[PDB]
């Protein structure tokens, strides 16, 4: 843990975990190149019978769909596009009980925690122009070295 860095747009380094500690549902962070690669990160509030609300994606107003089956568990949803206002696939299911998110990029593959909290699963996403992609935090986050990988995992499970 480095420090609760407020939301802002900048170039996210590598080999470092990005512990995002949001306060409520909604958008948490996003990142794209605005050329041929988009990757956003949003959170869904518990109890949701599949709804579709209108939100601003990278400045462009769009409609997103969310859902939830738990009562006190959040459901993180990661979206990705190929072109400007093109496709829109919402993947990357991650349930958090203690409320905590973390993301990282190494070896060109975005390492993010998946699955449920008590049983998270750090998967990876093959990339190419990752080094040429910017991110925009929508809340407070913390910086942590990849060396403490095991630390990040335990943090999401029942850290806070």
């Amino acid at each position: 843990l480095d420090g609760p860095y407020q939301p802002t747009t900048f170039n996210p380094p590598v080999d470092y975990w990005m512990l995002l500690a949001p306060t409520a549902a909604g958008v948490v962070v996003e990142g794209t190149n605005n050329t041929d690669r988009w990757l956003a990160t949003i959170l869904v509030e518990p109890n949701v019978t599949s709804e579709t609300r209108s939100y601003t994606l990278f400045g462009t107003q769009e409609q997103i769909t969310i859902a939830n089956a738990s009562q006190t568990q959040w459901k993180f949803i990661d979206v990705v596009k190929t072109t400007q206002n093109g496709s829109y696939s919402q993947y990357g299911p991650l349930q958090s009980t203690p409320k905590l998110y973390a993301v990282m990029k190494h070896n060109g593959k975005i390492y993010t925690y998946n699955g449920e909290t008590p049983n998270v699963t750090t998967k990876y996403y093959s990339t190419t122009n990752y080094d040429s992609v910017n991110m925009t935090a929508f809340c407070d986050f913390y910086i942590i070295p990849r060396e403490e990988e095991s630390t990040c995992t335990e943090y999401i499970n029942n850290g806070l």
Side-chain angles (χ1 to χ4, degrees):
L1 220 59
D2 196 294
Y5 245 107
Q6 258 92 275
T8 180
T9 313
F10 62 89
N11 259 105
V14 290
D15 292 33
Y16 307 134
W17 273 110
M18 269 100 141
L19 204 58
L20 265 62
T23 317
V27 188
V28 284
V29 61
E30 62 246 331
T32 168
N33 206 343
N34 301 94
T35 324
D36 222 296
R37 235 269 287 172
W38 283 259
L39 200 104
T41 312
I42 311 90
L43 187 54
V44 188
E45 52 167 273
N47 307 271
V48 188
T49 312
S50 335
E51 311 233 29
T52 307
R53 218 80 207 198
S54 55
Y55 300 119
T56 321
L57 297 181
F58 305 113
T60 337
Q61 182 226 345
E62 303 210 314
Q63 259 125 16
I64 316 178
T65 318
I66 58 173
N68 211 292
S70 295
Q71 26 158 252
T72 176
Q73 277 198 258
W74 310 77
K75 197 162 138 149
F76 290 83
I77 30 154
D78 272 90
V79 292
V80 189
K81 319 165 138 136
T82 74
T83 336
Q84 311 137 20
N85 309 8
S87 295
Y88 195 43
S89 302
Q90 311 141 254
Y91 280 94
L94 176 77
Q95 283 227 18
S96 219
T97 340
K99 316 166 142 155
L100 231 175
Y101 191 57
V103 188
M104 186 174 76
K105 279 149 65 257
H106 174 226
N107 186 21
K109 304 148 176 223
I110 309 137
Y111 276 117
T112 169
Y113 282 78
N114 295 247
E116 223 202 282
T117 355
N119 45 107
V120 293
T121 35
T122 17
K123 283 199 140 293
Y124 66 111
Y125 294 70
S126 40
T127 332
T128 49
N129 278 326
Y130 72 104
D131 251 87
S132 194
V133 183
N134 310 131
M135 272 185 211
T136 314
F138 240 76
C139 222
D140 58 330
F141 61 75
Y142 306 65
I143 310 95
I144 311 170
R146 64 87 152 70
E147 287 113 281
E148 283 237 286
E149 277 238 27
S150 318
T151 314
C152 220
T153 304
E154 271 145 326
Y155 259 59
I156 309 303
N157 278 259
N158 63 110
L160 274 107

